[PDB]
């Protein structure tokens, strides 16, 4: 992708995550499970909502009619009517197809950036208390219970709390 | 601790708001408007030359000589013709002004 997160170091997605678009998977002594990140998912949904609304809101319904047919004398104007309808038809078809193709790639890249920032927020939070094992995973060098797991997700994580606990395991190897 | 260095962006007292594809009413430090939404509310002189006013009497009466079209703007130059919507005095004698639409642009 453009940001290298989706189909990048994270090769595949989670089918078990059915509560949000982006989230975490934890594995501690108490148990394991999926949990979506609320901040990233809700903002993304509103952003894509605004993107879709930005396209279709102005495209309002029009009153149409067959109109008067053209007699033999009304040939030149009939050709002009064909010219304008075809001209608008060609322009609208080209613009609609082009906009969808361009915006779809931007939409895909939007998810790529949202996933990447989530990984960086965790990566910057943990710092040396975890190991980057790849595929978006973080092997903790210390003991992380459920409270510790949620602290990273809520953004209220404390590096000094497990600094010495991890450091002993870092210097172990 | 000790010495520190930071990286940040600029902020000011701007109240300008812009609408993006993903977000609405986004505050921006600077912006440019491309749409003029103000009008002075008066009919001015175009290219320096003042227009031609006619009042309740329309062009047809003015060029024909309607008796109500007697005292009005008698000028040699005009940028454009101004007709009030309430223009009723005109072709008092019933009839049709042939090529009236053509004459209106000719006398414009």
């Amino acid at each position, epitope marked *: 992708g453009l940001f290298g997160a989706i189909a990048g170091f994270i090769e595949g997605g989670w089918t078990g995550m059915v509560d949000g678009w982006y989230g975490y998977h934890h594995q501690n002594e108490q148990g394991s499970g999926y949990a979506a990140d609320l901040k990233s998912t809700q903002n993304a*949904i509103d*952003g894509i*909502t*605004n993107k879709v*609304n930005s396209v*279709i*809101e102005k495209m309002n*319904t029009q009153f149409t009619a067959v109109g008067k047919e053209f007699n033999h004398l009304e040939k030149r104007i009939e050709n002009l009517n064909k010219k304008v309808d075809d001209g608008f038809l060609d322009i609208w078809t080209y613009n609609a197809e082009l906009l969808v193709l361009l915006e779809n790639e931007r939409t895909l890249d939007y998810h790529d950036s949202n996933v990447k920032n989530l990984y960086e927020k965790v990566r910057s939070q943990l710092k040396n208390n975890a190991k980057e094992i790849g595929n978006g995973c973080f092997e903790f060098y210390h003991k992380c219970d459920n409270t510790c797991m949620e602290s990273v997700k809520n953004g209220t994580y404390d590096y000094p709390k497990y600094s010495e606990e991890a450091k002993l395991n870092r210097e172990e190897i | 601790p000790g010495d520190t260095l930071c990286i940040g962006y600029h902020a000011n007292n701007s109240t300008d708001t812009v609408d993006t594809v993903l977000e609405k009413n986004v505050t921006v430090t600077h912006s440019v408007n491309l749409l003029e939404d103000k009008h002075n509310g008066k009919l001015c002189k175009l290219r320096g030359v003042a227009p031609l006013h006619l009042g309740k009497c329309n062009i047809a009466g003015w060029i024909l000589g309607n008796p109500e079209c007697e005292s009005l703007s008698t000028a040699s130059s005009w940028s454009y013709i101004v007709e009030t919507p309430s223009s009723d005095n005109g072709t008092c004698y019933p009839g049709d002004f042939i090529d009236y639409e053509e004459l209106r642009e000719q006398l414009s």
Partner: nanobody
Amino acid sequence: SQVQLVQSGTEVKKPGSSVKVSCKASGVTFSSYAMSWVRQAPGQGLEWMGGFIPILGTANYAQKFQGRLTITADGLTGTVYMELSRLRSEDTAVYYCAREVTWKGASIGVLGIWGQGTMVSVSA
């Protein structure tokens, strides 16, 4: 601008039946804003039932309404329908529909624009 949500008229239904309530918008056609349904028993508080997200194309309901509620939307027209089956006298309330939007654009958590309300009465 000044969008108003117009719901269907008040309906009197027998117990154990199914009632469908429409929620049509005005102004800009072809909107994709998220919508929600909320009921209020006479003299009681507000109760959230469910909501629809046209972007996802799916709907989510509260636990008590899972299996009885069916929130549908007519494409992107902005009209959203509500279906409740196996009606009881405890469901007699005023039902509202709300558009989830602020002046900051789409807002999934809020209910900026509300409907006119639809009273539903249930008895044999």
